[PDB]
Amino acid sequence: MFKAVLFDLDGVITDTAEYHFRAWKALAEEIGINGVDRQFNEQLKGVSREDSLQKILDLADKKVSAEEFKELAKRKNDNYVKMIQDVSPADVYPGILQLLKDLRSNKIKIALASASKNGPFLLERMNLTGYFDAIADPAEVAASKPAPDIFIAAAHAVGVAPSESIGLEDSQAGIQAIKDSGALPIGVGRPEDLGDDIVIVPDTSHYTLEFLKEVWLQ
Ligand SMILES: O=P(O)(O)C[C@@H]1O[C@H](CO)[C@@H](O)[C@H](O)[C@H]1O
Ligand SMILES: [Mg+2]
C-alpha cells in the first residue's frame, strides 16, 4: 500500500491557483503583455515565481533589466500576499480536510510539495499545518517543477520512497515532476489540460482515501 501522499497546494488544497492567475495577469498587463489568459496560465501552474515571470516575458519576447525583473517578481508577490490575507479554513477545497484526517488515522505520511514560498502561511490560514508531517521548502530545492526534485524531497522528509507515494497535482509541470520522481500521480482538473495518460479527477471531492486505494490497486 502507498505510505505517503505528497500534496501540491495551489489548485489542490484550495483555490489559490486562481489567485496566482489573477495576480500574474495584472502584472503582465501593467507591462503591456496581454497574453496571460487561462490557457497560457496552464504553463504557470506549479512553476517557480521567477520561472513564471520569465515565461510571461518570453511570451512577448520582452527584455527587462535584472533590476526590473527583481522588482516585477516582488510586485506580483506583494499583490498576491495581500490577496490571500483573508483565506480561512472555509476555503479548504471539498474532500481535503477529511482526506488528511483519514490518512493520519491510517498512518500514511503527509508532505507538502508546493513551489510556493507562501505555502506555510496558507496552511496556517487554513488550520492545516498540524496535518503535515513535512513541508519541502522550495527555497531549498533549486530545480522547479517539472523537475522531480521537490517531490523527491517531500518523500524523503517523511522517510518514504517516492515509488511508495502518491502525488496530487493540478498542473502540467507538477504531473511531469511526479512521474519523474517515481511517485504515482492523480491529477485534478480537465483532461484537455492535464492529459489522458494518468488518472485525472474533475474536482477534489474525488480525493478520498477509498479512491486513492482504488487507484493504487489499479
Ligand atoms: O508563491 P510563489 O513563491 O510566488 C510560487 C508560485 O507557485 C505557484 C504554484 O504553487 C505558481 O503557479 C505561481 O506561478 C508561483 O508564483
Ligand atoms: Mg498547483
For residues 9 and 83, state if they share a domain: no
CA atoms within 13 A on the CB side of 14: 22
For residues 66 and 138, state if they share a domain: no
CATH number, position 158: 3.40.50.1000
DSSP conformation class of 180? H
Of all protein residues, whose CA lies closest to atom 15 belonging to ligand 1?
49
What span, in angstroms and rounded, lies between the C-alpha atoms of 47 and 44?
5
For 177-194, b/e burial (b = at least 16 CB within 10 A) is bbbbbbbbbbbbbeeebb
What span, in angstroms and rounded, lies between the C-alpha atoms of 87 and 127?
10
What does R_g of the chain's alpha carbons equal in angstroms?
17
- DSSP letters for 150-173: HHHHHHHHTT--GGGEEEEESSHH
For residues 143 and 212, state if they share a domain: yes
For residues 132 and 184, state if they share a domain: yes
For residues 192 and 88, state if they share a domain: no
Domain boundary among 75, 92, 109: 92
Range of the domain at 156: 1-14+93-218
For residues 84 and 1, state if they share a domain: no
Structural domain total, the chain: 2
For Cα atoms 123, 168, 156, give the angle at the middle one, nearest 5 degrees. 75
32 alpha carbon – ligand 2 mean position (Å): 26
For residue 132, the SS3 value is coil
For residues 131 and 53, state if they share a domain: no
Residue tagged active-site, from 10, 86, 133, 193? 10
For residues 112 and 193, state if they share a domain: yes
Domain boundary among 92, 110, 142: 92
Residue 10 in marked binding region: yes
Residue the block writes with cell 484550495: 14
For residues 88 and 100, state if they share a domain: no
- Which atom of ligand 1 is nearest the CA belonging to 11? 10
C-alpha cell at 202: 474533475
| Ligand 1 pocket by Cβ (under 6 Å) | 9-10, 20, 44-49, 52, 77, 114-118
- DSSP letters for 53-97: HHHHHHHTT----HHHHHHHHHHHHHHHHHHTTT--GGGSPTTHH
Residue tagged active-site, from 8, 15, 61, 91? 8
Cβ–Cβ < 8 Å for 209, 103: yes
Of all protein residues, whose CA lies closest to atom 16 belonging to ligand 1?
49
What span, in angstroms and rounded, lies between the C-alpha atoms of 24 and 192?
22
Peptide linkage before 146 cis (omega within 30 of 0): yes
- Which atom of ligand 1 is nearest the CA belonging to 47? 11
Amino acid in position 188: V
C-alpha cell at 186: 492523480
Of 50, 52, 76, which is best to mutate to test ligand 1, by the most ligand atoms within 8 angstroms of its C-beta? 52
For residues 31 and 73, state if they share a domain: yes
- DSSP letters for 95-111: THHHHHHHHHHTT-EEE
Is position 193 annotated as part of the catalytic site?
no
Q: Which long-range contacts (CB under 8 A, 24 or more apart) does 27-35 make?
A: 27/53, 27/56, 27/72, 27/75, 27/76, 27/79, 28/56, 30/75, 31/62, 31/64, 31/72, 32/60, 33/57, 33/59, 33/60, 33/62, 35/59, 35/60
According to DSSP, the residues that pair with 10 across neighbouring strands are 14
Residue 114 in marked binding region: no
Is position 10 annotated as part of the catalytic site?
yes
For residues 77 and 143, state if they share a domain: no
Amino acid in position 33: I
For 56-91, b/e burial (b = at least 16 CB within 10 A) is bbeeeeeeeeeeeeeebbebbbeebeebbeebeeee
CB-based contacts of 71: which residues, under 8 Å, 6+ apart? none
With CA atoms as reference, report the closest residue to 178 among 158, 151, 155, 200: 151
CATH number, position 58: 1.10.150.240
For residues 57 and 125, state if they share a domain: no
Domain boundary among 92, 108, 142: 92
